[PDB]
Symmetry: D2
Subunit: 474 residues, 4 copies
Amino acid sequence: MTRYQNLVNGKWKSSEQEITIYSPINQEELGTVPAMTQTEADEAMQAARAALPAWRALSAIERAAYLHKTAAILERDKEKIGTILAKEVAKGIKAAIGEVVRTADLIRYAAEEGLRITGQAMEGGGFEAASKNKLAVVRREPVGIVLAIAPFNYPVNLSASKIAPALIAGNVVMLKPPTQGSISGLLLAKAFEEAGIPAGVFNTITGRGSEIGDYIIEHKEVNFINFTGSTPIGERIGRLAGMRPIMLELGGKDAALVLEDADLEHAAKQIVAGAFSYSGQRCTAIKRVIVLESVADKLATLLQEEVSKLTVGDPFDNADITPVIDNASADFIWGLIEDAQEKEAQALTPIKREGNLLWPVLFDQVTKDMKVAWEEPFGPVLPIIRVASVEEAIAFANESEFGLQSSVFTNDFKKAFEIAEKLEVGTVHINNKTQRGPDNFPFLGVKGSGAGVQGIKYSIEAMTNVKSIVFDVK
Amino acid sequence: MTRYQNLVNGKWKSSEQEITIYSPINQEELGTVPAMTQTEADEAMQAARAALPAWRALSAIERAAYLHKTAAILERDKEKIGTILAKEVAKGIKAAIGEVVRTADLIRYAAEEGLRITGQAMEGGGFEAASKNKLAVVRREPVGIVLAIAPFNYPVNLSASKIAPALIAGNVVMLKPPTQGSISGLLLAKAFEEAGIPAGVFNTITGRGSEIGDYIIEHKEVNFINFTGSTPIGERIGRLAGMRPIMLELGGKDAALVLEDADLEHAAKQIVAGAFSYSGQRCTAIKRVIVLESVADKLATLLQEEVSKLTVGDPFDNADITPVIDNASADFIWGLIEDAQEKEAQALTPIKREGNLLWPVLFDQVTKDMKVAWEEPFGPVLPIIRVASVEEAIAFANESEFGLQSSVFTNDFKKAFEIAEKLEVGTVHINNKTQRGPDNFPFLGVKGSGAGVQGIKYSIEAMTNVKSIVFD
Amino acid sequence: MTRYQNLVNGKWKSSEQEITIYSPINQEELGTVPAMTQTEADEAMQAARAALPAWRALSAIERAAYLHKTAAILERDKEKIGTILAKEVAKGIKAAIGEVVRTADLIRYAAEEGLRITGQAMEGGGFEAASKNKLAVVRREPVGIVLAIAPFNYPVNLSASKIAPALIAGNVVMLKPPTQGSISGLLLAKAFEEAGIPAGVFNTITGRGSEIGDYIIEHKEVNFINFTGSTPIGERIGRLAGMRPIMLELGGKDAALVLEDADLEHAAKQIVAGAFSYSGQRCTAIKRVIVLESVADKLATLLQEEVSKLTVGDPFDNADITPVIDNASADFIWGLIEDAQEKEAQALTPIKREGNLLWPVLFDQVTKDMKVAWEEPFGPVLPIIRVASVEEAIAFANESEFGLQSSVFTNDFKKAFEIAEKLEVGTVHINNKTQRGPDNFPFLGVKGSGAGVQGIKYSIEAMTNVKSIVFDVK
Amino acid sequence: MTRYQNLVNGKWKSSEQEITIYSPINQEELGTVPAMTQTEADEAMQAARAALPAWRALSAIERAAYLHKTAAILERDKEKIGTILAKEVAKGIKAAIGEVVRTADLIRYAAEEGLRITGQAMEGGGFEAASKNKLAVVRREPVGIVLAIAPFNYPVNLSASKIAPALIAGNVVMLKPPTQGSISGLLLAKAFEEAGIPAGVFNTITGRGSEIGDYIIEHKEVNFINFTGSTPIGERIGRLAGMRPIMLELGGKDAALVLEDADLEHAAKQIVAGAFSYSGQRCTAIKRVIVLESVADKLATLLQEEVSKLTVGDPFDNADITPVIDNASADFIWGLIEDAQEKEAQALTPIKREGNLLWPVLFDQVTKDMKVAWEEPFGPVLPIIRVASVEEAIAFANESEFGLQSSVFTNDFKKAFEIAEKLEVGTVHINNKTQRGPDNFPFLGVKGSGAGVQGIKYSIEAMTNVKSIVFDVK
Ligand SMILES: O=C[C@H](O)COP(=O)(O)O
Ligand SMILES: O=C[C@H](O)COP(=O)(O)O
Ligand SMILES: O=C[C@H](O)COP(=O)(O)O
Ligand SMILES: O=C[C@H](O)COP(=O)(O)O
């Protein structure tokens, strides 16, 4: 019964109350995290504010040295961290060891990306002849206190993808780990503390969302909100932030537009590997298949073979399909499956449940009226939608409320490029599954998938402030 | 009795109701502008949404051609537009003609800068050996319908600085000209219509702010709100926009920090020219002087002479101090002046009201308890605040709720650079007054002066969406 | 008999000796240009060196104003300059006025692009913690005097492409027009002087190569040599320039790699349009077809139909095949054609020669021993080369000594991209012919095809010097 | 008595003959170096040509892993390499060890900088409406084989500054160590080979310039020459290169312009620290004090006491003034001192000579007639030159045939910026000594002082070719 604590002003501290964390696999007690109160969150913010000056008065290479030390420690304990993460959010054990390794690679790259940030030296001579002697030296300064709110699916990766870009840029970071996955956020904080990050530069906040979860967002000391989660909470954040800068990475129903000339075997393998990784619990996952009618049958057969080869089971057996995060999540996904079945959709895959453990349901004949065609299941369902033309596929893709990513499988790259130009998404992948990619590529969503563009350089550039210094050079 | 109309879907439209516009100089009826209803706003947004795809299907050079045409036409009617915008916001006629010519120059520069927006080609390898031979082609696409809300002080320049950067990027623009200054917004729309801009690409919205003011901000067709105005209204817009991208350019109490080793004559001339241009109704004006005690008396004397050389009167006489925009504005300035003089501030110039026409009040011995050290007047009042140290000056400057711009007057540029690093503003000017400047320069506020970075390149970038395309 | 004059120090200057220029189409006469002596070249160089300080002192928008005025005057006298151009180099009057118009467009774009050249404000904190208070403001200064040597092909376009990028960046320009199309260069100077560009900012130096050819290149006043022409002369310039910066745009042997999946009709049309534009006298024209065996016969038939549809005549009938520039050119192309004939290459189109007027020769079954497979003809002859594999095509394309551009005609863009990365050229066009393209695109050659990157942005950057100013900010 | 060998194709080689290398400190023999022949140089070039298309095919992060391994090994053996370097080139032991760790974190920065080189995605629609659908994907490809020639000055630092920016860019490198400092080049090769660098990727050439000196520069395998030496040999190289790209870092005569408002104590300290570091044997050292007559006497006294407190002796006692590299250098420097004192220059510090070890000479009343005012001594001689105005100082500064770096000591920064923009140098330091600076900063000479822009990013981009791939998106 481990009693994990909160990093606050460089000291590990606990709270009077604590939240118990149960495995989504078998409800094993993983430990407890403190249930902070509003005054505790307030004092963590005031520690951050006090640590900010000396942190941004450091040279970039020094902050990067701290970051590199953190990444080394994180890679050192990749199995300790990986096991706890694997039982905390019920993801495959190699998938959970893989997240820690990808995390360390991400913060190494962010440390090295954020010490190469170059300003501009602009002159007014090109705009007007009267300002020919004026020189603006434009650079970037930290926004201040960055508040990072991590999601459950990648509690170590999508938390470090906010902490490391903010830290190298000179900001202090306040981390809010998810409700499920908070022990992993505290373990990330342990790696940061072991590195030697100065007191107050990185603080953690754990608690009930009904007590401090709004209080930390509307706090006056917070200068930037970096949030990954679902679109409802993201829309609430966008209004609770006022006009303070935010980065929201919300839900996505990513389409796989498959056309007649698509190499269907590769398309099916990629579509299934994208759709069912972490049992569908990914924002950047293939969440619908929009296939043309002429190849829809063969694509459905290949998709069925791929989805039948998926091993459902328990995280430590390295199952492709592990239990979903909550019972409420399984109930919501089950409702989507029920609604599809009631409207005469062809479930060409066993449709059975075992509590949290759902089965990789591949549906066909999915129409506009089924909720599985629009709602993000965040679980193991994959709709197949048949369209008559490319225009119908593009209209179906752009009918979604989400614009995160999309895949276009073709053989004609000129055709794929103009479809990609037509798709109202942030990223289009040509003949590949949709993903966050190398975390040096831009990662952004549109209409409902969030605000701002991520990617390591884009995240460093987003939690900074432009400061122009203008003088005369005669 | 000119009945100005609204550009919607290329055609000119009027409404049943009408707002009447009176000069802040002598209250003459300048004309009337339509008071659109929420349904008419909706139709303007639908015209915009239908015009968007053919506008971004146009090549960049083809849209820049329209922008250059509009700038040439607008410079053609520099005197006609200038007189109307002079008597509409009580701006000096040589400054109102200058606003139009600088507007034309901004549209030219925006066209030619939005021609050259180049994307990236990232390679994946270098972050992972697995993602080697994945190529991301990163480019920018228009956000969609850009809603621009212009301020009264520059109805033509600060509406074009939202329209032209958005239009060149591929967006369609829905302009919301201010209440005082709506006629100049339609005079700017006249140029866009004359220069063959396609239907629905540029539309104008005029009406009472209690009928369509929130209806247009909250509309779902709006994809970007570009707003210039006051901090209360901007803070309201910030929440009303949701997670839609916004550009807010709110107020600012720009400080003029003067040190002991500083050319006081140059500093005084710059401080007064900045502070009292358009009689203080500028977001980027010197709105407070923070001088060190040793040079405070010499600077006060020099500042007083500079203020005394100011001409107060009528815009068409090219006065330095024309009347403020409204009576409520003058009452608010007069309240600040009263609060200051009822607290023993040394008024160094003759406090004198004549209706809207206020007088260039220069105050001294201003402390933190007077509400003129903190509140942005938007009128002809300059507080001198004396501090004992450079640290005291920086703390006083950073105590403001605004962070737009600031000036540091000294002779040690290394000292000025250090102070500029410490100042929580967007732009620091060393040994010059604050200004929006060369409009290619970044223009931004922090802390409460706004959200986002303006300046033409930054404006074009802000109203676009990154569109990555990854392949093998 | 029009006695054209050299623009020197704002004044029109003539010489004791004048070179006479005759029409390549009928040897008529067009006028004379001053054959300057070396002292005259010195006075032009000194005029430029004295004009340099006040031209640099100008604001960028003020320098751009002259450029825009020149562009307007050029677009005004489009038909006059065009007629003299089509007379000078036998180009085709609708393709000669097009050169004048594309030249004014280039000048406008160069002015507007040079307005926006922004510097860097680099900090040392990312590299070391001891330099964290040092700021480098890095901007670009003019090199000084730029010597632009134009070719006969495009004597106002490939001349403006050196003058305008140089002028907008603050340099003063020496223009050495081609010995043949010099009258067109003096017309360009007429336009620049009419715009009102200051005295000594743009001068022209005509003459005989044996007197002032190496003389102006070796002058110590010249700070940059921008030369486009033939590869041997380019090598001589590369030696003669010492360590002074140069930009050489030399010959090319651009290949059209045609694979089996290619759309052969599009390939044939693109290849013929690229290859026979201006009678093959372009460095960026297609100059050899490298085609796989399977589709080679169908491609050759399509290519033959395209070639035997080209108009051969005089420039004022707007012929696609107008006479080559001089008699030595026609003799060299005829020699290549003969060498191909004796080694049993299949002439797919008639082999005719009416003096300078050559007929377009499509040669099939061309092998590595015929010299038309390697040498740049600068004449209307295109060899088709058959290869058995994609690797054979890449080996044959990279066997050339030239590296300017190439086309890959394919249907698989992934394959086309792989081949493009394998081709040793500056630019690869996928399913299109080679061109200088939009002039904002980079234009460069590799191994034997030149030195430096052209394109308006790259040309502006090439003829400037980085000037870094480093100071403490704390 | 160690016999060092040449890294060729992953193997160590002696040739038949060996150049024996002696310590410039006394004469102590420290080893021999293979006197390679033209044939062996050819085999090394061919090994590099064969290793190229596997190093290119590697990922940027893998090539960077090799670079980081080399940097780690280099810091592991900093004292052994440093001691050998200090006796090899006669610099203080703490300064020879300090260019081994400065070299290692030059190598780290080079790798981290080279693995985020981004390309462009240019569209043609801004230039013309006919090319709106053309997209250029502009990326950078390795130049090929890089020839790096190091100077004796920094045989490790000024060698890695060419190797690492090359190797990270994907192109293989051949290193020619200086004749005096060959041991250090082979010691750096030892670290590169120990790191695991693939065979043929990093080779080393030693021998006699009369045998293999022009032979390697003129070799057709070489695609880029990166040379830092003296202006004569750089003039030869710029000619022998042809049109092959080169980077030349030649000599300098950096001036410290001191005006009347200047802080004279700071100027006096900075000037001596910059001028006499490594016995004045740096290209970027201060070699000229140009001071206004009002403050010239006070400056001269401060400078004299600054120079007098320097220590002259042995490198292992960490003398500030260690002996110059060879006897020819001491003869030339003594000739400069001679010419100065015959023409009635006022020696402010004693002039001495102990064969190779000279004493630092502060010369006042230096005029444009003494050779010490114009020639680069590469020895501990600093001439003070008095001028009557700032315009006279700028005229004297620009009178030099060198354009590398310059210092302006002022108190008015607007004045210092004015003068800096007037100065014909590559870098101007305001109120600080000239230096190569943080190596991320641009480093260049703009006169007969060099060709090309160095600095880690600038040298990475110099030894690459732009490759544009243009296709239609439509
Ligand atoms: O929330 C899930 C993320 O958006 C999915 O991206 P990732 O699995 O590549 O980190
Ligand atoms: O309303 C505020 C404007 O941004 C001020 O413009 P300006 O500083 O150029 O005079
Ligand atoms: O000399 C010939 C030029 O390089 C060919 O290019 P261009 O005809 O497209 O301008
Ligand atoms: O030019 C050479 C500089 O004097 C020293 O170079 P470095 O930065 O490698 O030590």
